[PDB]
Amino acid sequence: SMQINLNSTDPVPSKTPFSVSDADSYNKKGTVTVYDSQGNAHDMNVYFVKTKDNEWAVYTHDSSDPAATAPTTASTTLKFNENGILESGGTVNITTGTINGATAATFSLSFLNSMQQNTGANNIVATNQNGYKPGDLVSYQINNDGTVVGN
Amino acid sequence: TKDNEWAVYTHDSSDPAATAPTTASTTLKFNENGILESGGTVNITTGTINGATAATFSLSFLNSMQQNTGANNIVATNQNGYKPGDLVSYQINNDGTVVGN
Amino acid sequence: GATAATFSLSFLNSMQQNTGANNIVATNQNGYKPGDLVSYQINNDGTVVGN
Amino acid sequence: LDENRNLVNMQGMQLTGYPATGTPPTIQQGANPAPITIPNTLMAAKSTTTA
């Protein structure tokens, strides 16, 4: 889940089309860390480029895989209503690369609760993901309800 | 040797005349989840020191798991052979069993 | 009468550009010299190291 | 600055923050926080493209 605030007054970049190398070719860049079956960390870089009013193309690319294809086609397109409510395109299936034999991470990334107004700057409100790396017992505790919880 | 493929060699450092391992002792293969699929057990024979028999034992890598842990850590090691020893103490357990330590 | 020492000398990371003059950025080597123990210490990670 | 010239506290506590990425490197607020590194390596030259 990736929740952002988008600024309506950002000018459309002149350096069309989208290029990963070109920093000015995208309005916003964010990063979300996902994990595969073997626990490898993939830093999904996502790029936000305003196409027209209330229409934002979102591109995705993993920096972990050097053999991954360069993003040249829209990963998703957020369409927004008049008052900053989401309309369509807020959820997209995303597949990572194959690193060290780990299967590509296929996960549904959702832009729900995203709201677009006249923010003073580009900020990402929240990034959540349900994957993690392998962990080992560092502590254990008993809560007031009797739950035994190992941290 | 490549992704999810680990050649495993065995050597005996105790034997002053031990031969340097030149051939692979076994090959651990790993599934998509990092679990064992093959090669987890292999019969290893030691050297002959002081005229005693070499120990021919089954080395099992059961529950070995390859995933993105920060480093290569050995979780558990166990062997069922023991050296001779003298009686040190004794006890009577709550279930009536007499145990000599 | 020492045995001949043959070493791999590498000018890696050296560059030819418009610097003000010929300046050596760094030198590194793996050879060393004999000397007696001076100090011993135990670091925060439990390593016992002698200097 | 520590042995690798990174920003550290008394204990060696490494400072982290938003790094500079791209060519030329730029501040990316959306990038993951990374340790701040201050190498002493000399800066190369960029050919003039717009004047």
Side-chain angles (χ1 to χ4, degrees):
Chain A
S1 308
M2 152 75 88
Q3 185 183 0
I4 63 184
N5 289 346
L6 288 164
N7 174 36
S8 71
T9 65
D10 313 319
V12 174
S14 60
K15 208 158 194 176
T16 56
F18 161 68
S19 167
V20 279
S21 316
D22 292 358
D24 50 358
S25 78
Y26 51 81
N27 291 86
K28 182 56 182 198
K29 175 186 171 171
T31 302
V32 48
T33 309
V34 317
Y35 305 98
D36 306 359
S37 67
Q38 314 283 6
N40 313 67
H42 291 251
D43 311 61
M44 291 324 317
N45 293 190
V46 310
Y47 315 68
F48 311 84
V49 185
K50 189 181 173 186
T51 59
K52 277 165 289 312
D53 294 334
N54 309 330
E55 296 197 345
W56 305 77
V58 179
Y59 295 137
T60 55
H61 172 67
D62 59 346
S63 62
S64 298
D65 183 16
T69 54
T72 56
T73 307
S75 306
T76 191
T77 301
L78 307 177
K79 298 196 174 212
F80 250 92
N81 310 64
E82 291 96 50
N83 296 323
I85 313 299
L86 185 64
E87 184 182 52
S88 65
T91 290
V92 61
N93 294 326
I94 281 181
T95 325
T96 69
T98 298
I99 284 294
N100 292 122
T103 177
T106 298
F107 65 95
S108 171
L109 171 149
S110 179
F111 270 89
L112 218 50
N113 303 323
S114 299
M115 165 152 184
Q116 160 207 307
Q117 294 307 349
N118 187 231
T119 56
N122 291 333
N123 182 60
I124 289 158
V125 152
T127 61
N128 321 143
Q129 64 93 37
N130 70 331
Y132 37 86
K133 325 164 72 152
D136 313 302
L137 279 192
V138 305
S139 68
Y140 44 101
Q141 64 186 62
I142 303 173
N143 300 332
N144 65 61
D145 310 287
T147 65
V148 189
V149 176
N151 176 211
Chain B
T1 206
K2 66 151 200 290
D3 301 334
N4 314 330
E5 281 315 91
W6 294 77
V8 177
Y9 294 92
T10 81
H11 174 61
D12 189 317
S13 164
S14 298
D15 180 18
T19 56
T22 316
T23 58
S25 266
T26 189
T27 49
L28 303 181
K29 303 200 177 212
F30 284 136
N31 320 69
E32 189 47 53
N33 295 325
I35 316 315
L36 279 193
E37 61 156 320
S38 64
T41 56
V42 58
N43 266 32
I44 300 330
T45 301
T46 48
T48 295
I49 308 314
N50 294 120
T53 71
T56 75
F57 53 80
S58 171
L59 164 40
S60 182
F61 279 89
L62 189 67
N63 264 307
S64 307
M65 206 203 97
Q66 178 214 285
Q67 191 158 329
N68 194 337
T69 290
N72 296 330
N73 312 36
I74 301 157
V75 153
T77 55
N78 170 282
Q79 59 90 32
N80 76 329
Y82 48 65
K83 24 186 182 67
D86 249 342
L87 184 58
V88 152
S89 63
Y90 67 53
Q91 63 189 62
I92 300 172
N93 289 324
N94 304 347
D95 43 358
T97 323
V98 187
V99 174
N101 303 3
Chain C
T3 206
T6 299
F7 65 97
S8 171
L9 182 58
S10 182
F11 297 102
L12 186 67
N13 304 321
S14 304
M15 85 199 64
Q16 183 233 1
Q17 214 161 104
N18 197 234
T19 54
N22 293 335
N23 185 59
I24 292 162
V25 175
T27 61
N28 205 335
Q29 59 94 37
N30 74 332
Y32 266 122
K33 34 163 161 173
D36 53 38
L37 183 58
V38 202
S39 64
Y40 36 58
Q41 61 182 59
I42 303 172
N43 302 306
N44 64 62
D45 38 35
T47 55
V48 188
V49 277
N51 316 337
Chain D
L1 320 157
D2 91 334
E3 193 171 355
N4 284 58
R5 303 298 181 169
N6 327 299
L7 281 183
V8 281
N9 267 342
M10 291 335 89
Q11 304 80 35
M13 274 337 313
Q14 297 161 294
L15 207 41
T16 166
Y18 296 126
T21 62
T23 306
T26 54
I27 293 301
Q28 291 290 77
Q29 295 202 338
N32 289 174
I36 317 201
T37 57
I38 307 186
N40 60 347
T41 316
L42 171 148
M43 211 206 288
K46 177 180 172 202
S47 190
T48 303
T49 281
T50 303

